[PDB]
Amino acid sequence: SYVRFEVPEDMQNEALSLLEKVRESGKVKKGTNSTTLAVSRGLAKLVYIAEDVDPPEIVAHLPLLCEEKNVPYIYVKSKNDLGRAVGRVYPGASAAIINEGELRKELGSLVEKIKGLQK
């Protein structure tokens, strides 16, 4: 009940692949508290939220805060996928790219693509 728009599956997978790549080059915040702080501080360039978080209430504030702070965010179906993308063998509920490192143009294009999605 926190999923506010449908993300095509190819963009989810494109977003998760970029997140894996940003780790070596840039900076990612992992977990809901750190993601929230990054959004609040205006440092979040792109926020990831898994659609199967347990309990869903822990991320319910995040889409609304991202919209308030004009921070792009994207849903991914699987918290297990999100955890692997941030480099972990356990699930991840949410994450934020803070510094894209050398992937500025790729992040740019993905953000534009997310912005174009019907909401």
Strand, helix or coil at 96?
A: strand
Closest CA to 47 of 67, 25, 23: 67
| Backbone dihedral angles phi then psi of residue 57, each to the nearest 5 degrees | -65, -20
* Least distance from Na ion to the Cβ atom of residue 20, Å: 16
From the list 7-15, 17-25, 57-65, 96-104, the region that binds its own copies by CB under 8 A is 57-65
* Given 4, 13, 42, 60, the residue binding its own copies (CB under 8 A): 60
Strand, helix or coil at 85?
A: helix
Q: Please give, one letter per residue, the 3-state secondary structure of 9-57.
A: HHHHHHHHHHHHHHHHHCEEEECHHHHHHHHHCCCCCEEEEECCCCCHH
Nearer to its own copies, 41 or 104 (CB): 41
The reply on whether position 111 binds its own copies by CB under 8 A is no
Strand, helix or coil at 104?
A: helix
The reply on whether position 116 binds its own copies by CB under 8 A is no
* Least distance from Na ion to the Cβ atom of residue 119, Å: 20
The reply on whether position 4 binds its own copies by CB under 8 A is no
Q: Using CB distances below 5 to 8 A depending on partner kind, what does residue 36 bind out of its own copies, Na ion, none?
A: its own copies
Where do contacts with its own copies occur on this chain (CB under 8 A)?
32-33, 36-37, 40-41, 55, 57-58, 60-61, 64-65, 68-69
